[PDB]
Amino acid sequence: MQLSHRPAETGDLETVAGFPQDRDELFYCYPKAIWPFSVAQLAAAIAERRGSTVAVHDGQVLGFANFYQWQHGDFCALGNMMVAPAARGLGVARYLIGVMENLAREQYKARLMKISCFNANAAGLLLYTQLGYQPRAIAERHDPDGRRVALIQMDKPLE
Numbered sequence: 001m002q003l004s005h006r007p008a009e010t011g012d013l014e015t016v017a018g019f020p021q022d023r024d025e026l027f028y029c030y031p032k033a034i035w036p037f038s039v040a041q042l043a044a045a046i047a048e049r050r051g052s053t054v055a056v057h058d059g060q061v062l063g064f065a066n067f068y069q070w071q072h073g074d075f076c077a078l079g080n081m082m083v084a085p086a087a088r089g090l091g092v093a094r095y096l097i098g099v100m101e102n103l104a105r106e107q108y109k110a111r112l113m114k115i116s117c118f119n120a121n122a123a124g125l126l127l128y129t130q131l132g133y134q135p136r137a138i139a140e141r142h143d144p145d146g147r148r149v150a151l152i153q154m155d156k157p158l159e
């Protein structure tokens with residue numbers, strides 16, 4: 001995979017908004033959103049966050065991520081981690097997570113990256129573990145049907 005990255009642009013919105021394939025996927029990556037996802041919801045997120053970044057391979061936008069919390073000299077918290085359905089398991093998330101770790105270190109002088117992953121997302125839990133994130137706490141949250149879910153709060157020192 002010959003991946004590159006750059007800040008997200010207006011022209012990328014419609015592509016990225018296409019990535020979540022069902023309510024579960026949308027909830028795992030953006031729990032405040034409402035299905036169906038839309039460019040307007042994505043742009044709202046981008047406006048209130050920092051670091052929105054796309055990953056590109058062979059002229060295609062295949063991944064997106066940003067920070068929903070950032071604290072200079074401290075930590076950032078990774079959000080909106082989305083991958084195109086034709087590129088799942090090919091290393092795009094792993095790549096973009098590395099890019100975002102660098103951006104957190106270099107631009108925000110972060111010592112830590114935080115990632116919160118919902119219990120049902122096994123693939124995410126195992127990816128973040130492979131990348132060196134450790135579980136720190138479990139929080140009770142609710143899904144769109146009002147059912148209780150467990151949010152696993154993980155972190156990793158940067159360097």
Ligand SMILES: CO/N=C(\C(=O)N[C@@H]1C(=O)N2C(C(=O)O)=C(COC(C)=O)CS[C@H]12)c1csc(N)n1
Nearest residue numbers: 028029030031068078079080081115116117141142
């Ligand atoms: C105010 O806090 N309430 C939360 C909560 O922790 N939201 C946070 C947020 O924004 N996150 C994103 C996010 O929107 O980016 C992701 C997605 O993480 C990745 C790695 O894609 C995982 S949950 C976290 C919450 C969650 S469910 C619920 N009923 N409340």
